[PDB]
Write a protein that binds this ligand. Structure first.
Ligand SMILES: Cc1cc2nc3c(=O)[nH]c(=O)nc-3n(C[C@H](O)[C@H](O)[C@H](O)COP(=O)(O)OP(=O)(O)OC[C@H]3O[C@@H](n4cnc5c(N)ncnc54)[C@H](O)[C@@H]3O)c2cc1C
Ligand SMILES: Cc1cc2nc3c(=O)[nH]c(=O)nc-3n(C[C@H](O)[C@H](O)[C@H](O)COP(=O)(O)OP(=O)(O)OC[C@H]3O[C@@H](n4cnc5c(N)ncnc54)[C@H](O)[C@@H]3O)c2cc1C
Lengths: 401, 401
C-alpha cells in the first residue's frame, strides 16, 4: 500500500506538508522530492503581500525540518512517469524508481489570449521570480493595469497603491472575487479599493493592446507601464494526462488522495476533489487545502485506519487595511450580518446559512470571531439566528457548547 | 491486474457488453453479474419506441450468448462492497468475493421536487416496469403531460400521439433537447411536434399540482390524466460513494475504466469520463457509450496492450416520422446545412465545424450520410466547405479518401 520508495513531484506547500507528515507519522523509507524551481521551498501568500513590499525571500521559506532525511532535487523537472515500470524521467537525464508516486505540481496562471502578442510588459504573479520581476517595475507614479478582480490581483492592487503606483483594474464579472466570496463582501471590497484610488472597471474585457495601451471591449483604452494578468490558474496536470490518469483541469482524487492509477496519488492545487459542503467536485486553490490535504493523505498512507481528508475549505486575503477571512460556502438561503459594514474602521462578520445551518462565514478585521465560526461550520451548527445577529453574543461560547 | 474472479454490478447493456467482450477476448475465469431487476437483460431504447407501441418484451432482450459461462443473479441488489476485503454484500444475504469489481449500475430518472406529494399519476420512464405502467395508461383521448423536452420525453410524445393520446409538454429551457443537440435541429423538432398536435410550453416550470391539475410558474394550469417526468437522470453511484471512490453524480473513470479504488472499474451511464472532442469530463447517457465503453474496458483488461476507450459520442432518437442521428459536438464556429429543412418529407444533414475541422454532425432521415460523417469526425477531417454544402458531393467518397 504505502510502498517505498516515495517520490513526490513538486516542492511547494502541499509537497512539504505531505513529506513532513510522512516522517512525523513514522514512515522511515526513502523520500525524494523533485522541484522544478531552483529555490529553497517557499510559501506563496507573501508574494502579493509583505514580500512584494519588503523583498526578503529569507522570510518566506517553508520549514523542512519536520521532514528529515528527504532528498530535494531542486531545479529539476519531471518530464514523464511510467506507471507500469514505476519510474519517473527527469530533465537532468536521471530516472527515479517509486513504490508510491505523489503528484503535487500545483497550478499556473492562465494566459490572456488577447495579450499574446503584446509589446509592453505583461506579467503573471505565481512564483518568487514573478514577484521579483513585478516589484522591479512598481516605480512610484507609474501606471499598473491589473486584469482580473480575484484576491491576488486585489492584494497586488493594495500593495501597489501603498507604494505610490497608480492602479487600474479590469474585471469581466460585475463584481470582484466572484469565486467563493459572498456578494456583501465583494461589494464592500470594491468600495474600499475605489476609496484608495483604484480605478475599477466592471463588466469589461481586454480585446488587445497596441504600443503600450490596452484595448477594452467597450471600445476604449487604458494606458499602462505594466499589465499584470490574474484571471485564475490552470492545474499542472500534464504528466498525469500523458500517463492516462483521469484529469480535467485538475487530477481527480478521492479523500485518500488516490488518482485513477494505482500507486499514484495527488494533492494540493493540482487536484480536483470533493468539497464536503457542496458535495461537488472542485479544484480548490487555497493554502489551507495544500497543507491540510497533504497532511491527511500522508497520515492515511502511513496509517490506513486514519480517516480520509475531511477539512472544510477556507482562505484569507490581506488587502491593505482589510484582513479578510472566508470559510465555507459564499452563499446559502440566508446571510446574517454582525456589526456594521463601513469604511470607517472596517470590522464585521457575515454568516451564511442553509435551512438554519451554518454553511459559510466571513470576518473582516476580526480574527477572534473566525475560529469559533469555523468550528460551528464544521459541525453544521444550527444556532439561534437572533443571537447570531445579537452583538451581545459570544461566538466562542456558542462553539464550546 | 485482470484478477479473477470478476464481479459486475448491474445487468444492463454496459454489463452485458463488458462480459461478452471478456469472453470473446479469451478470459476464462469466473464471471458473476448482479442485477437488481428481475428481468432477462434487456435494451432500453425500445421502451419509448416500438415497445411502448406493441408491448412484446421478448423483442427487446439483450443477447447474452457471446457471454457463455456467466452466472446472472437477477432480482438481487448489491448493498455494499468492501474494497479491502474484496467482497460484495448482496440483498439475499450472500457475499461474493472478487479479484476485479466492475460497477455498471447505470442511472435513474431525477424526481421533480414540486410533484413529490402529488395525488395524480406521476411516472418516470427508465425500466420495463415503468414502460408497462405508462402504456397501461395511454388510453386514446386521454391527456398526458410530459415534463422535460429531452429525447425520451419527445419519443414518448410521438408514441402517445400515434396512439391517440393528447399530449402537452413543459420545458424549462427555451428549446427542446438542450443537451447535445444543435439548435437548428431542436428548432425543427419543435415545429414537427407542434404540427403533430403536441402542446409545447417553453420557458415554463412546474410549481406543483392539485386534484389532477399541474401548476406552472406563469401562474397557469394544465389538466392531465397522467404526468411523465423526464428531466434527466442521476448516476447510480451510491455504492461507490459509500466505499470511498471519487464521484460527483457519476463515478470518475479514466480511459481504462479505472476508478480511484484499485481493482474497481466502472462503465456506462454510471460514469463521468473524458469526452475526447471537448476534452472535458462528462456523464455520457447513450446506448453507444454503454456498449463501446464496456467493450473497450473489457478488451484492455484482458489485453493491457490494447488502447483505452477512444470512441467519439453519438446517439439516435426515433420521434414519429423523424429518424434523428447526432454525433459529436452540438456546436462549433460553423454549421453547414445539407438539404432543405422542411416538414414536407423531412430529410437533411447538419455539419458542425471548428476552425474548418468537423466536430459534429446530424442526420434526419438520412442514415446513409451518417456513417461517412462519423468517420470524417473521427479523424478530425477538414474538408472543402462548399463541397460539404454542395449537394453534388458524395460523403462516402470523401470518407474513403
Ligand atoms: C501570489 C499568491 C498569493 C496567495 N495568497 C494566498 C493566501 O493569502 N491565502 C490562501 O489561502 N492561498 C493563497 N495563495 C494560494 C496558495 O499559495 C496555493 O494554494 C498553494 O501554493 C498550493 O500549493 P501546491 O503545493 O499545491 O502548489 P504549488 O505551490 O504551485 O507548488 C507546485 C510546485 O510544483 C512545481 N512543478 C510543476 N510541475 C513540475 C514538474 N513536472 N516537475 C517538477 N516540479 C513541478 C511547480 O512549479 C511548483 O513549484 C496564494 C498564491 C499566490 C501565487
Ligand atoms: C426509455 C429510454 C430510451 C432510450 N433511448 C435511447 C436511444 O434511442 N439511443 C441512445 O443512444 N440511448 C438511449 N437510451 C439510453 C440507454 O439506454 C442508456 O445509455 C443505457 O441503458 C445505459 O446502460 P447501462 O448498462 O450503463 O445502465 P442501465 O441500463 O441503467 O443498467 C444498469 C442496471 O444496474 C442496475 N443496478 C443499479 N444499482 C444496482 C445495484 N446496487 N445492484 C444491482 N443492480 C443495480 C440498474 O437497476 C440497472 O438494471 C434510452 C434510455 C431509456 C431509459
Amino acid at each position: 500500500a504505502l510502498k517505498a520508495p516515495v517520490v513526490v513531484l513538486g516542492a511547494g506547500l502541499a509537497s512539504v506538508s505531505f513529506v513532513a507528515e510522512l516522517r512525523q507519522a513514522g514512515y522511515q523509507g526513502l523520500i525524494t522530492v523533485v522541484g522544478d524551481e531552483a529555490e529553497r521551498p517557499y510559501d506563496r501568500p507573501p508574494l502579493s503581500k509583505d514580500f512584494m513590499a519588503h523583498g526578503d525571500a529569507e522570510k518566506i521559506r517553508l520549514d523542512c525540518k519536520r521532514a528529515p532525511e528527504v532528498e530535494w532535487l531542486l531545479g529539476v523537472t519531471a518530464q514523464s512517469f511510467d506507471p507500469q515500470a514505476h519510474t519517473v524521467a527527469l530533465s537532468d537525464g536521471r530516472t527515479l524508481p517509486y513504490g508510491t508516486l505523489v503528484l503535487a505540481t500545483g497550478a499556473a496562471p492562465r494566459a490572456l489570449p488577447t495579450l499574446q502578442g503584446a509589446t509592453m510588459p505583461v506579467h503573471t504573479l505565481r512564483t518568487l521570480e514573478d514577484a521579483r520581476r513585478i516589484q522591479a517595475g512598481l516605480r512610484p507614479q507609474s501606471r499598473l493595469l491589473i486584469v482580473g478582480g480575484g484576491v491576488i490581483g486585489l492584494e497586488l492592487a493594495a500593495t501597489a497603491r501603498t507604494a505610490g503606483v497608480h492602479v487600474s483594474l479590469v474585471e469581466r464579472q460585475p463584481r470582484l472575487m466572484s469565486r467563493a466570496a459572498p456578494a456583501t463582501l465583494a461589494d464592500f471590497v470594491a468600495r474600499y479599493h475605489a476609496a484608495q484610488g483604484v480605478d475599477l472597471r466592471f463588466e469589461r474585457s481586454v480585446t488587445g493592446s497596441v504600443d503600450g495601451v490596452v484595448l477594452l471591449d467597450d471600445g476604449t483604452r487604458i494606458a499602462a507601464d505594466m499589465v499584470v494578468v490574474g484571471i485564475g490558474v490552470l492545474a499542472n496536470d500534464a504528466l498525469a494526462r500523458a500517463a492516462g490518469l483521469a484529469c480535467d483541469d485538475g487530477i481527480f482524487v478521492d479523500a485518500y488522495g488516490r488518482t485513477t492509477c494505482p500507486d499514484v496519488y495527488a494533492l494540493g492545487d493540482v487536484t480536483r476533489q470533493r468539497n464536503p459542503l457542496s458535495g461537488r467536485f472542485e479544484r480548490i486553490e487555497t493554502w489551507s487545502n495544500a497543507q491540510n490535504q497533504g497532511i491527511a493523505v500522508a497520515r492515511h498512507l502511513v496509517d490506513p485506519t486514519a480517516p480520509g481528508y475531511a477539512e472544510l475549505p477556507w482562505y484569507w486575503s490581506d488587502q491593505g487595511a482589510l484582513r479578510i477571512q472566508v470559510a465555507g460556502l459564499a452563499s446559502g438561503d440566508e446571510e446574517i450580518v454582525r456589526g456594521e459594514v463601513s469604511l470607517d474602521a472596517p470590522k464585521f462578520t457575515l454568516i451564511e446559512l442553509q435551512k438554519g445551518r451554518i454553511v459559510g462565514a466571513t470576518c473582516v478585521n476580526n480574527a477572534r470571531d473566525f475560529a469559533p465560526l469555523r468550528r460551528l461550520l464544521a459541525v453544521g451548527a444550527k444556532p439561534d439566528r437572533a443571537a447570531l445577529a445579537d452583538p451581545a453574543t459570544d461566538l466562542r461560547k456558542l462553539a464550546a457548547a
